[PDB]
């Protein structure tokens, strides 16, 4: 299956390519940096972004979105984590969110896929904890601060085994199950 991908993150392309390697499907990724909307419903937020990507391409195209949900912040981000990270980064993240009373937070990936006829939404989630100190490499955003639940290593420090338990994985496993199960 020849499915296209529109994004802004460049490392997201390499993660999706390494996850879907050897499956049979291929991804023709392109970089356009589609702006999202400020809404709480992630279904509408993935629906209009997939609409803008289908207006850009006109072929079968999928669209990913990834959201952190801080339980101490009453579930504030998710849909708008980008501006959050591109502002505070890692220095002003762990000193005021990793040292609070509730370090618990959940990270969700939602995939919106268009088969040039309909819109299909697949999602996956992992729970975790915010590190008090940033740890590991710092080339993929909030990977160096995200401790998953049941582990003591961040997703940047744990290496290539992050793409076996991560939420994007679960979401792309459901996406892969749909793509090899047929256009149902």
């Amino acid at each position: 299956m020849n499915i296209r991908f529109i994004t802004r993150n460049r490392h997201k392309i390499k993660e999706i390519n390494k996850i879907l390697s050897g499956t049979g499907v291929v991804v023709l990724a392109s970089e356009h940096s589609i702006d999202e909307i400020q809404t709480e419903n992630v279904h509408a937020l993935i629906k209009d972004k997939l609409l803008k990507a289908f207006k850009l391409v006109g072929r079968p195209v999928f669209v990913e979105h990834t959201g952190l949900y801080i339980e101490s912040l009453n579930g504030f981000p998710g849909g708008l984590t980008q501006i959050f990270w591109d502002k505070l980064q890692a220095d002003k993240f762990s000193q005021l969110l990793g040292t609070s009373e509730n370090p618990r937070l959940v990270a969700k990936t939602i995939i919106g896929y268009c088969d040039s006829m309909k819109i299909y939404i697949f999602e996956g989630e992992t729970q975790g904890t915010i590190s008090p100190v940033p740890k590991g490499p710092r080339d993929f955003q909030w990977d160096c601060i995200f401790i998953p639940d049941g582990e003591s290593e961040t997703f940047a420090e744990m290496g290539d085994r992050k793409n076996e338990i991560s939420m994007r994985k679960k979401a792309f496993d459901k996406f892969k199950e749909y793509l090899l199960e047929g256009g149902k």
Binding site: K47, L51, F54, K55, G58, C114, S116, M117, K118, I119
Partner: protein, 264 residues
């Protein structure tokens, strides 16, 4: 506006009715029809919105489904459900109680005829040339210009039907082309977007230009609640003036516009 009332009291104004009159009743809109076609063909609507506009969508539904028959059945059942009551519609009451001798409409529903028969006014419904043979001059002529739900071959909804109507060889086209000669047309609820009506009024303007009598052409009017200077200039080239209102609600604006016609 004053010359419109002077021509209306003389009896020289033809009423043209669009879908904006019928959207006050709670009927499905054009977008809901687009949605029904999209989920009937297996699409969701927003992914069928990037492909064509309206003619490509009714043409594609006709080509995949074979005919317009399932769609007409659905529009017949939805546009005439029992929840819609014509008695709570001030616009249709003001249309019925006014003295318009000839009424054209691009609606396929029968709510104009239902409103005329509710308030005790006799009429003649015209949708074929055999109904043109039944015209009484003491009764209202209601012409279903784009078809009715009684005949699938008369519904002008898709691109091929508009391509047939562009040649103006239909009897209803001939009757309209002579009815606009020397009579004013008042468009209510209508945006003048159908290409055959624009070609008809362009040819009428050309016709009055070839006789060197452009100042003697009757003037047409369109009631648009939202202003549009682009259309205003374009329709002013075809002697169609624009009447606008400052009310944001289109139904109450149309009620206040037709209040000048129902009374006396």
């Amino acid at each position: 506006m004053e010359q419109l009332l002077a021509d209306y009291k003389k009896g020289n104004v033809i009423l043209f009715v669009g879908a904006g009159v019928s959207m006050n009743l709670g009927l499905p809109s054009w977008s809901q029809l687009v949605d029904h076609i999209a989920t009937e063909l297996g699409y969701d609507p927003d992914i069928y919105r990037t492909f064509g506009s309206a003619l490509e969508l009714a043409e594609y539904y006709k080509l995949k489904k074979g005919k317009i028959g399932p769609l007409r059945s659905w529009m017949d059942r939805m546009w005439h459900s029992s929840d819609i009551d014509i008695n709570k519609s001030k616009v249709h009451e003001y249309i019925a109680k006014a003295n318009f001798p000839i009424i054209y409409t691009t609606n396929y529903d029968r709510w104009i005829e239902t409103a005329l028969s509710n308030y005790g006014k006799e009429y003649i419904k015209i949708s074929s040339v055999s109904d043109i043979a039944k015209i009484d001059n003491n009764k209202t002529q209601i012409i279903k210009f784009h078809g009715d739900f009684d005949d699938d071959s008369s519904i002008v909804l898709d691109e091929t039907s508009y391509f047939q109507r562009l040649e103006f060889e239909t009897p209803l086209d001939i009757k309209f082309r002579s009815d606009v000669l020397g009579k004013s047309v008042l468009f209510i609820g209508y945006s003048l977007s159908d290409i055959n009506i624009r070609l008809l009024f362009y040819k009428l303007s050309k016709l009055w230009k070839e006789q060197k009598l452009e100042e003697a052409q009757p003037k047409s009017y369109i009631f648009l609640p939202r202003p549009n200077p682009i259309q205003e200039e374009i329709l002013e080239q075809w002697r169609i003036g624009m009447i606008s209102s400052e009310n944001d609600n289109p139904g109450e604006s149309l009620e206040e516009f037709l209040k000048n016609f129902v009374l006396v």
